[PDB]
């Protein structure tokens, strides 16, 4: 079987994870499940970026040691992914020796090759802006930020520097060979002012001002700078430079690195250059989504302008939480959270459109045939040929949207099919057919189309929702695992033996 490897970013446990982090991890989970259903050998990784001054500060901020603070935070994150039913195959932590050893190895290798050299970084850090500046960029100079008005802090410390400019021609050559590397196309607007043409400055890849992180074996006063440390997670979790590299050679290069837009530059410039320096294959694709916003900007874990996903899961359930994120907030833009939109998505799309349809269909199969669904014969009603064609086009359109990670467009397309199946009841009028004994076949045909239409939706929603499709298969009494796969949607009319549906149809209530 063909392999597929997808990653989220390793999240910085500086606070509790909000719904933006949930979107990222659910989005990657949707693809993982989707790819497993297509017949790929999938590995899906997530994790925690546990080193840095920022973690060292947040442990200070919560008046506590480094490793005690983290253990408590990592427990909460694993509990969240458990509650979200994320099908991640592994959880990488940068504090683990399996990661650390590889970072140490990589860093000493770059040292041996001459790629890195000892020096001093001198610059101007704006405390509010969280961005470094040169002295010429300062306003009223020891000066003000050009972006804001806050005066800057002078930062001088020993640092290793990585000669990245020599990989410029190979990087530009890689972009030419892989013009669709960054998806969606709007996200390579993050590559504006990239400095590749005029010349990339040597990157400061270690700190001496703090001591929390991966220490450089040659010079332990230095700690490896957080971004090269963090990016190693994608290859270290597969056992790169360990005594078993079987996962690395099976899954690398990664098919998708998933993220939000603000780390496209890091994943598109620094990460391929690092891989080039190790003579490793480059990632296939970078998929970057937008931000969930509030009323004071992007949802931020250090700021606290957040919605806790535990609140949404506890109150409304898992399916409503997962559906809302994927449907309401498109991959290719930013989006505002509101409690209004959440209940509308929950009640109108899930409980009504899908939930009514299932209840209506089972109620009529119980009423007219005593639960005994007649087998699919063919498109016997005059509308069936178009509707069966629509079902096939729904799967094809769904596929196109899913391959480009347009999750809201895929779900929107699925919901047009669900709505049309509700309208199919209205315009066929089974209750009227049921009065005439001579129309029993047509009535059977109509019920058969309703059940098959529902099965199409349920299969397509398996990557998105973990409970409701399973609940739908149980009530309709589709036990065969074959009828739950994508391949069974390739031709309409799967159920050609009669089926007994449930006698006590409960609400699906997704
Ligand atoms: N508002 C958001 N919308 C979507 N994704 C988000 C959001 N915030 C964080 N993420 C996800 O987390 C990744 C960034 O992880 P990070 O660890 O920095 O959390 P943070 O909230 O961005 O940081 P900070 O702690 O500085 O606010 C993004 O690339 C994205 O995957």
Swiss-Prot record:
Q: Where does this polypeptide localize?
A: Cytoplasm
EC class of the enzyme, as a word: ligase
| Keyword line | Aminoacyl-tRNA synthetase, ATP-binding, Cytoplasm, Ligase, Nucleotide-binding, Protein biosynthesis, RNA-binding, tRNA-binding
Where is the motif 'KMSKS' region annotated in this sequence? 298-302
Q: Where is this motif: 'HIGH' region?
A: 11-21
Q: What GO cellular-component annotations does this UniProt entry give? A: cytoplasm
Any GO molecular function? ATP binding
Q: What is its main location?
A: cytoplasm
Which residues are listed for ATP binding in this entry? Answer: 301
The protein's annotated catalytic reaction(s) are: tRNA(Met) + L-methionine + ATP = L-methionyl-tRNA(Met) + AMP + diphosphate
- One biological process term in Gene Ontology: methionyl-tRNA aminoacylation
What is this enzyme's EC?
Answer: 6.1.1.10
Q: What does this protein do?
A: Is required not only for elongation of protein synthesis but also for the initiation of all mRNA translation through initiator tRNA(fMet) aminoacylation.
Q: Which family does it belong to?
A: Belongs to the class-I aminoacyl-tRNA synthetase family. MetG type 2B subfamily.
User: How the protein assembles, per its UniProt entry?
Assistant: Homodimer.
Under what name is this protein listed? Methionine--tRNA ligase
Q: Which residues of the full protein are shown?
A: 3 to 520 of 657
